[PDB]
Tab-separated table of C-alpha atoms and ligand atoms in Angstrom:
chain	number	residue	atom	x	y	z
A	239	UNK	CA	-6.605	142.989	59.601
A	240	UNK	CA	-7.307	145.732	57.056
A	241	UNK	CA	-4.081	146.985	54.612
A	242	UNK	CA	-5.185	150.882	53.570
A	243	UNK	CA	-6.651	151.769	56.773
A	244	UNK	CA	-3.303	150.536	58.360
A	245	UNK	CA	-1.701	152.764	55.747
A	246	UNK	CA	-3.999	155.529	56.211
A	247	UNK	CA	-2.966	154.926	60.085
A	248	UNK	CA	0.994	155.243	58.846
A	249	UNK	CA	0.092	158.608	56.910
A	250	UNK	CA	-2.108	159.957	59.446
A	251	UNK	CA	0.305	159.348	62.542
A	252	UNK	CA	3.070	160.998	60.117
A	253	UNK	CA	1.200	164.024	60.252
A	254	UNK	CA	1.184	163.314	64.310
A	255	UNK	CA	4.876	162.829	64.335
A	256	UNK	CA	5.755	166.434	62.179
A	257	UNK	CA	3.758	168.835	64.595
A	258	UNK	CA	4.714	167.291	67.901
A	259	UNK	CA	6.607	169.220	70.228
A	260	UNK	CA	7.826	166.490	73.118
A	261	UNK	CA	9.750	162.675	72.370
A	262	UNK	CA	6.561	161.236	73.800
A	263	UNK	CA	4.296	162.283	71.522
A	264	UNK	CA	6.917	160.982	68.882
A	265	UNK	CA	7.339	157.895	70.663
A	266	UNK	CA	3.894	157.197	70.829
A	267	UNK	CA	2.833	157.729	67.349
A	268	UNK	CA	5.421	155.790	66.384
A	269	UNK	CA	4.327	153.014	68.664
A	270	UNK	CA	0.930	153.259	67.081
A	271	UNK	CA	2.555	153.323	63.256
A	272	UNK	CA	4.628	149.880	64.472
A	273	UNK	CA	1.213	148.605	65.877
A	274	UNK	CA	-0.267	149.662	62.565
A	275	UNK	CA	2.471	147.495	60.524
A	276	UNK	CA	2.324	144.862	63.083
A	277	UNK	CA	-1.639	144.532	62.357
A	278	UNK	CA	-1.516	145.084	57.994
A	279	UNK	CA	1.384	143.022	57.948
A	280	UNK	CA	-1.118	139.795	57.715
A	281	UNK	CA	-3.130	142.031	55.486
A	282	UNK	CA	-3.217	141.699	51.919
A	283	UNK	CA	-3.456	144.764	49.378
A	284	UNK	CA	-7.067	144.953	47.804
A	285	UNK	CA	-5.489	144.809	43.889
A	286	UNK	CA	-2.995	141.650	45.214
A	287	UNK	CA	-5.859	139.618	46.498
A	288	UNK	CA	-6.212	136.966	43.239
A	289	UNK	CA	-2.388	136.518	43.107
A	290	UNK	CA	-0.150	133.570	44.559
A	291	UNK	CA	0.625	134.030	47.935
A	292	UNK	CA	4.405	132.420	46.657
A	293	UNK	CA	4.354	134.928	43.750
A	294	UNK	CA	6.769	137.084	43.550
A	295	UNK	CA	4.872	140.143	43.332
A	296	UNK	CA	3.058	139.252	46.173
A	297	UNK	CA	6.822	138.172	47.927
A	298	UNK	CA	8.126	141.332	46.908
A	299	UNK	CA	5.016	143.083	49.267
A	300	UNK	CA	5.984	141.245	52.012
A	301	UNK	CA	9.698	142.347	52.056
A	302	UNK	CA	8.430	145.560	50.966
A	303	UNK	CA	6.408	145.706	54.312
A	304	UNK	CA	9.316	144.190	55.981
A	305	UNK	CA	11.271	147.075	55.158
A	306	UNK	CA	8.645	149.468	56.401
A	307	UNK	CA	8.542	147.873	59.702
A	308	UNK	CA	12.445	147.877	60.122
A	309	UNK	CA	12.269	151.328	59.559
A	310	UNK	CA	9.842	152.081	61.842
A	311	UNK	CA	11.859	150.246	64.540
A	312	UNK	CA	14.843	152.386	63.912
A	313	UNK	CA	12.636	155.571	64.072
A	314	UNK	CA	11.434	154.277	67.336
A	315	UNK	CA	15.077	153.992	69.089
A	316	UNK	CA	15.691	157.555	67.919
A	317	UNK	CA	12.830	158.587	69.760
A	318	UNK	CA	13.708	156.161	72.666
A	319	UNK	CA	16.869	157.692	73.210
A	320	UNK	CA	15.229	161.433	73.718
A	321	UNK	CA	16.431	162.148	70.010
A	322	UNK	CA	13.388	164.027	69.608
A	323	UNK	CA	14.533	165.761	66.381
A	324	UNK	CA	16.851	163.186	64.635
A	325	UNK	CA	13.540	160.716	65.246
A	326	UNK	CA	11.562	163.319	63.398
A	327	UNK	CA	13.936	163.376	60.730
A	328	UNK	CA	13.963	159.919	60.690
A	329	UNK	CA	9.872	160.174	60.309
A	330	UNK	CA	10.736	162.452	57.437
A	331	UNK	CA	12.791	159.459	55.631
A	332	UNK	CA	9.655	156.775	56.857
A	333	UNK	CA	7.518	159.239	54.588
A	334	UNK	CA	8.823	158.301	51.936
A	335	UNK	CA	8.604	154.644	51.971
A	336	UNK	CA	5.265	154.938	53.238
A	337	UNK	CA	4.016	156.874	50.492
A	338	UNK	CA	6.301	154.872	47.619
A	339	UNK	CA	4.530	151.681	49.141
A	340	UNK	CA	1.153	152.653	49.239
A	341	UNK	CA	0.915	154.337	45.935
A	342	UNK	CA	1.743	150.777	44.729
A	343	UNK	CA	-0.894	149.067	46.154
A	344	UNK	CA	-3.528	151.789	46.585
A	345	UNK	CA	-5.985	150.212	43.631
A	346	UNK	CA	-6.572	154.072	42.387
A	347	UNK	CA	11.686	148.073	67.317
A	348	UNK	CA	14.961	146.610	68.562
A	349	UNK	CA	15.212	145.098	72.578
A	350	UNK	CA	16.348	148.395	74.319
A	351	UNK	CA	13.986	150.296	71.585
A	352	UNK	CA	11.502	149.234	73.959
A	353	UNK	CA	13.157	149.216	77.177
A	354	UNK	CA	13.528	152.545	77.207
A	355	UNK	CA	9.665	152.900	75.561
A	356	UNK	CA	9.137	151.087	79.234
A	357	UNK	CA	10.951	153.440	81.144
A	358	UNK	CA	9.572	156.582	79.291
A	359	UNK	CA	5.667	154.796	79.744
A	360	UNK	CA	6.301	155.067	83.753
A	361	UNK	CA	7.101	158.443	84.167
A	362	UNK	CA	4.087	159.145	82.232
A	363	UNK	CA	2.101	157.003	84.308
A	364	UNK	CA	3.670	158.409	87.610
A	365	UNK	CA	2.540	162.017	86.196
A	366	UNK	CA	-1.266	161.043	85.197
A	367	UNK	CA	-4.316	161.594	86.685
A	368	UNK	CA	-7.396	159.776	85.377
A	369	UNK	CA	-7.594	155.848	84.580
A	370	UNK	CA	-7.070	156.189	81.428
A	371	UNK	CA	-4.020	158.257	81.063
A	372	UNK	CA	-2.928	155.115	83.030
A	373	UNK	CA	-4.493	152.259	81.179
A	374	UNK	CA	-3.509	153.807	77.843
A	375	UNK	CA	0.245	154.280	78.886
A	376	UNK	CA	0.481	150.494	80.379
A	377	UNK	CA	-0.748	149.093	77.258
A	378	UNK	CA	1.843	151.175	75.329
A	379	UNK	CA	3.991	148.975	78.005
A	380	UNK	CA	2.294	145.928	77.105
A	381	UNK	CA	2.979	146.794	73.015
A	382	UNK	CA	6.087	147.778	73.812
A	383	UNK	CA	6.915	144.142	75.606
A	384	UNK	CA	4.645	142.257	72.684
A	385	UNK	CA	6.914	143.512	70.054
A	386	UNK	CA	10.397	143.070	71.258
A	387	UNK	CA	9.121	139.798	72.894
A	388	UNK	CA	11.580	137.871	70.236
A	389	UNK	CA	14.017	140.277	70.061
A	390	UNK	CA	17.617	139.780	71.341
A	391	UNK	CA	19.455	142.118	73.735
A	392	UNK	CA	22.577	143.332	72.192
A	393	UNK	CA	25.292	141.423	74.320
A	394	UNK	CA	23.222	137.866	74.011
A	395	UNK	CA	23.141	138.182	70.021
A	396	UNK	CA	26.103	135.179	70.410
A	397	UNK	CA	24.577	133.199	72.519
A	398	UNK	CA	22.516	130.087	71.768
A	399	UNK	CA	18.907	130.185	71.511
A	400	UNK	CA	18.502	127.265	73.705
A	401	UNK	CA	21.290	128.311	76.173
A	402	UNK	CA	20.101	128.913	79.816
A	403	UNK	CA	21.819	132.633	79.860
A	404	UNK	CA	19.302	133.179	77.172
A	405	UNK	CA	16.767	131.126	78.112
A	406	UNK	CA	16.673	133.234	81.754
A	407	UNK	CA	15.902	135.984	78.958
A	408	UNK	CA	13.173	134.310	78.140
A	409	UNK	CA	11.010	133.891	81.228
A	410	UNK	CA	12.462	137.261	82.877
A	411	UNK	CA	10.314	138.763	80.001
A	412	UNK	CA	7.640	136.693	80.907
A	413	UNK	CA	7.640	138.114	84.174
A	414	UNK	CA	7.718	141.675	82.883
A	415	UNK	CA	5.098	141.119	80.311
A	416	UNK	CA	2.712	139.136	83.063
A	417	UNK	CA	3.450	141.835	85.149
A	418	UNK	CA	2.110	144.641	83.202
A	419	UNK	CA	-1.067	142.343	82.811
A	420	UNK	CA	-1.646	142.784	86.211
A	421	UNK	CA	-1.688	146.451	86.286
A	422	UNK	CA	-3.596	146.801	83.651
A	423	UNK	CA	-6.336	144.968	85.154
A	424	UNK	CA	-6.437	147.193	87.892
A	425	UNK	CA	-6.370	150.669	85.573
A	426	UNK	CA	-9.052	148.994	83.725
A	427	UNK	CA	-11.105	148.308	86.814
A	428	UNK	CA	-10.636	151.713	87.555
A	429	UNK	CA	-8.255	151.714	90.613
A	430	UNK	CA	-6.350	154.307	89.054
A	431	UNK	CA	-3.959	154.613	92.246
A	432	UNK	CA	-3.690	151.107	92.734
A	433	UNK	CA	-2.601	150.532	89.647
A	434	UNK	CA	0.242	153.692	89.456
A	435	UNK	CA	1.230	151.326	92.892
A	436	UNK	CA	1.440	148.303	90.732
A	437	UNK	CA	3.194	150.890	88.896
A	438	UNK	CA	6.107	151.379	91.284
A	439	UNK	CA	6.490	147.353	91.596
A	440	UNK	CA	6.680	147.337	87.699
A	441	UNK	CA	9.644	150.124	87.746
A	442	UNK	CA	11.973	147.668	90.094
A	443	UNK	CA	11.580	144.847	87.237
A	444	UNK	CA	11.918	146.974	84.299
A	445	UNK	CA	14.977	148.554	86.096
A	446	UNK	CA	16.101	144.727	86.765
A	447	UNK	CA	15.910	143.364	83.810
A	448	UNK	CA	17.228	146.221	81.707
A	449	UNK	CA	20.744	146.536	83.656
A	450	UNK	CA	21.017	142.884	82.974
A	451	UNK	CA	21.073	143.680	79.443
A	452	UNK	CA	21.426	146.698	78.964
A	453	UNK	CA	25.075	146.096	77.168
A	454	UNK	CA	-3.250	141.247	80.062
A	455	UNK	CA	-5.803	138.492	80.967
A	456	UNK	CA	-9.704	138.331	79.297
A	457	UNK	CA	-11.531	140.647	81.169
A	458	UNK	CA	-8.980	143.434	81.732
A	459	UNK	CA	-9.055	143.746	77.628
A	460	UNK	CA	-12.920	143.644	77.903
A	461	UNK	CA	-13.057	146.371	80.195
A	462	UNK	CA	-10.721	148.731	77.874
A	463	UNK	CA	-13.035	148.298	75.149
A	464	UNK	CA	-15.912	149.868	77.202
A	465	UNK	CA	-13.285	152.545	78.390
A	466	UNK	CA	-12.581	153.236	74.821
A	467	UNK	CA	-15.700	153.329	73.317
A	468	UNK	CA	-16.679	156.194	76.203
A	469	UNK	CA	-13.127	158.089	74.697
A	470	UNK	CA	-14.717	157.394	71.235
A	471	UNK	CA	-18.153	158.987	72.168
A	472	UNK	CA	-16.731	161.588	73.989
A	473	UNK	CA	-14.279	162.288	70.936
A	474	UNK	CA	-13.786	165.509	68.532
A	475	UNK	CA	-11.356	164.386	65.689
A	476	UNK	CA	-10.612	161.772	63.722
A	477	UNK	CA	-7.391	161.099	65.283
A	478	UNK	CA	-8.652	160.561	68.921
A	479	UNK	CA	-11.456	158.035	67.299
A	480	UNK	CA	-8.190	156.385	65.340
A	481	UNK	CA	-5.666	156.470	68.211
A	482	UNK	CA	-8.721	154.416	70.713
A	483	UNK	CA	-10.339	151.991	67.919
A	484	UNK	CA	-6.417	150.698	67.365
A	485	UNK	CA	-6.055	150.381	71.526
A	486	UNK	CA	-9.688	148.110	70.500
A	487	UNK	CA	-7.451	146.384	68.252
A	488	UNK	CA	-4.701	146.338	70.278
A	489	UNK	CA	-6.805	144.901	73.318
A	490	UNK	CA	-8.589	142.595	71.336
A	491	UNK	CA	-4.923	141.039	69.943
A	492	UNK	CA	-3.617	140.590	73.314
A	493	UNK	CA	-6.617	139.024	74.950
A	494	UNK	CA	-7.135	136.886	71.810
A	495	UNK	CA	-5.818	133.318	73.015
A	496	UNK	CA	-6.889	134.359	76.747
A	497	UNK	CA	-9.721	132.688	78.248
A	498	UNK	CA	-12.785	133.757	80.397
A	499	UNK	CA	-12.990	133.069	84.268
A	500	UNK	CA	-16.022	131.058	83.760
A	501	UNK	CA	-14.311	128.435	80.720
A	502	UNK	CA	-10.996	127.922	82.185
A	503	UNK	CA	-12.175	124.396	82.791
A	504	UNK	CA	-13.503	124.150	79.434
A	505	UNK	CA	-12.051	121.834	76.500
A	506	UNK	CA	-9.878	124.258	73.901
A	507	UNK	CA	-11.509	121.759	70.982
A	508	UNK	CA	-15.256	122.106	73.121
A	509	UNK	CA	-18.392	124.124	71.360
A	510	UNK	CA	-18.906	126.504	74.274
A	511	UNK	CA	-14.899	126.936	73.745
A	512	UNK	CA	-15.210	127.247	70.535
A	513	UNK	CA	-18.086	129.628	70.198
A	514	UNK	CA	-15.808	132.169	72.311
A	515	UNK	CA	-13.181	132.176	69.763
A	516	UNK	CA	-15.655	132.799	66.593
A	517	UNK	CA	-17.175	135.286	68.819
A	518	UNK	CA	-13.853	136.972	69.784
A	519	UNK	CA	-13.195	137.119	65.458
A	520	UNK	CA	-16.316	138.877	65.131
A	521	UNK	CA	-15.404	140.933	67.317
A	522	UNK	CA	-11.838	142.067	65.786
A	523	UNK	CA	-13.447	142.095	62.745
A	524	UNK	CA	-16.188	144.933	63.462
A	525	UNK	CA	-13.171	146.981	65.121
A	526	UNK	CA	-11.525	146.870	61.740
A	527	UNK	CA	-14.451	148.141	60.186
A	528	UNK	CA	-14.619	150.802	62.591
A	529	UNK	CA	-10.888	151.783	61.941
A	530	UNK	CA	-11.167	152.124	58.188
A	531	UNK	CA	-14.503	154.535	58.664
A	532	UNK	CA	-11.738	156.326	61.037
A	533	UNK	CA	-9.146	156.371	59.172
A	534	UNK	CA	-10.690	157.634	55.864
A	535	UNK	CA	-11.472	160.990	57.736
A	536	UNK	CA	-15.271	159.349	58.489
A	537	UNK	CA	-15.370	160.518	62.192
A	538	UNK	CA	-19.034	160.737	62.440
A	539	UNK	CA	-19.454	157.529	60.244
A	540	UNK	CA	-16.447	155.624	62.477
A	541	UNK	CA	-18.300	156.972	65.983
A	542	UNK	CA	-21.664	155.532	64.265
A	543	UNK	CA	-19.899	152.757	64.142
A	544	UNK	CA	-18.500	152.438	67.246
A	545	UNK	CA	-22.059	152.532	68.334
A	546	UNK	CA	-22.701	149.090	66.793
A	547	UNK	CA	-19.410	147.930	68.007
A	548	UNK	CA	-20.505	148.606	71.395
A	549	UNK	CA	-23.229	146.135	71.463
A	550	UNK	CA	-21.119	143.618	70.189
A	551	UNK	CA	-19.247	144.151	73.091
A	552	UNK	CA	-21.667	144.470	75.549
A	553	UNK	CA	-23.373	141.197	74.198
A	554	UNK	CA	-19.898	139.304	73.901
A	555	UNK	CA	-18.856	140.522	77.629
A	556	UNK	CA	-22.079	139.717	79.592
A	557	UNK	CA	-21.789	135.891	78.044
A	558	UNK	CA	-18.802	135.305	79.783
A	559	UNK	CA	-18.051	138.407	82.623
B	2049	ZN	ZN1	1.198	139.958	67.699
């Protein structure tokens, strides 16, 4: 992905983080600052780019991001918890890596952490009213579940990666994460009360699986980037055009090694295959773009952008709706 749009994402949602008023708006930027680190992580600084990728200045950005992210995980359970004002003085702390690691390369969350990020998601979803406060929340569920996929719960940290009590740990979050796939299908078609039923079925395994611990496919994606791009148009900040390009990017990373109804019974190593996943890089690669326009303060220039970026996705989704 991009690295100083990512940062520019970190400062921005900082700024988020100090004038909110609830733990869900908290909780949420957050999310969106993890999703932020998760993205730059793979990113390299523009001033690092001719050095070793085993040098150790270039090793010593990669622990230095590694602390960044950590951080942002333990924010994130503060904010999990309901701490809404010990997470915001944890934000205050994340400042300050996140400006001491940016000014260095500028040129000129745990298993409950989540689980509770699940529970929280539901009641918001239980409380919305349009599609999107729906389809927006679930894929908060869906980040949520992508991020602590290989975490541990804390009473299995001594068990053995390979042993069956933890191996059950592994497909039960299948089921949760295939789960929320479902639902967000049917936000993103816009069943919007459907879905908050699908909902209620996803509250009974997220309550399941987190007492037992507790110590989406191609063309739902597709169909959030054409809801986002009509949040984007309809937008008045920067932030708003920020917050939807990274659910673009968020969509686009979850539905990356998906497949289209219509090549399911195409070879992974075939042309017409192959074409889709070149086509899908494009496509992640204009909503970069479009981020970095956002995230320098360009709204106009990011929306303009997003105009381009919805024929791209109008072009990529008719091939293969
Ligand atoms: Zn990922």
């Amino acid at each position: 992905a991009d690295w100083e749009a990512a940062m520019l994402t970190l400062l921005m949602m900082l700024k988020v983080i100090e004038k909110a008023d609830n733990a869900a708006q908290v909780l949420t930027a957050l999310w969106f600052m993890a999703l932020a680190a998760h993205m730059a992580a793979w990113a390299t600084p523009p001033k690092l780019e001719d050095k070793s990728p085993a040098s150790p200045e270039m090793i010593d950005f990669r622990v230095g991001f590694e602390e960044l992210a950590t951080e942002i995980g333990k924010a994130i359970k503060l904010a999990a918890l309901g701490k809404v004002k010990e997470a915001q003085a944890a934000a205050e702390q994340l400042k300050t890596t996140v400006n001491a690691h940016w000014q260095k390369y500028r040129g000129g969350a745990d298993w409950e952490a989540a689980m509770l990020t699940l529970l929280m998601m539901l009641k918001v979803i239980e409380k919305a009213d349009n599609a999107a406060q729906v389809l927006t929340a679930l894929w908060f569920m869906a980040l949520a579940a992508h991020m602590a996929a290989l975490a541990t719960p804390p009473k299995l940290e001594d068990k053995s990666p390979a042993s069956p009590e933890m191996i059950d740990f592994r497909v039960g979050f299948e089921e949760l994460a295939t789960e929320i796939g479902k639902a967000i299908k049917l936000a993103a078609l816009g069943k919007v009360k459907e879905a908050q039923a699908a909902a209620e079925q996803l509250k009974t395994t997220v309550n399941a699986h987190w007492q037992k611990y507790r110590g989406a496919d191609w063309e739902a994606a597709m169909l959030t980037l054409l809801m986002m791009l009509k949040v984007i148009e309809k937008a008045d900040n920067a932030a708003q055009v920020l917050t939807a390009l990274w659910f673009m990017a968020l969509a686009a990373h979850m539905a990356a090694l998906a497949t289209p109804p219509k090549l399911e019974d195409k070879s992974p190593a075939s042309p017409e295959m192959i074409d889709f996943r070149v086509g899908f890089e494009e496509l992640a690669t204009e909503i970069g773009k479009a981020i970095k326009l956002a995230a320098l303060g360009k709204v106009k220039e990011a929306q303009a952008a997003a105009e381009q970026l919805k024929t791209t996705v109008n072009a990529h989704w008719q091939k293969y709706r």
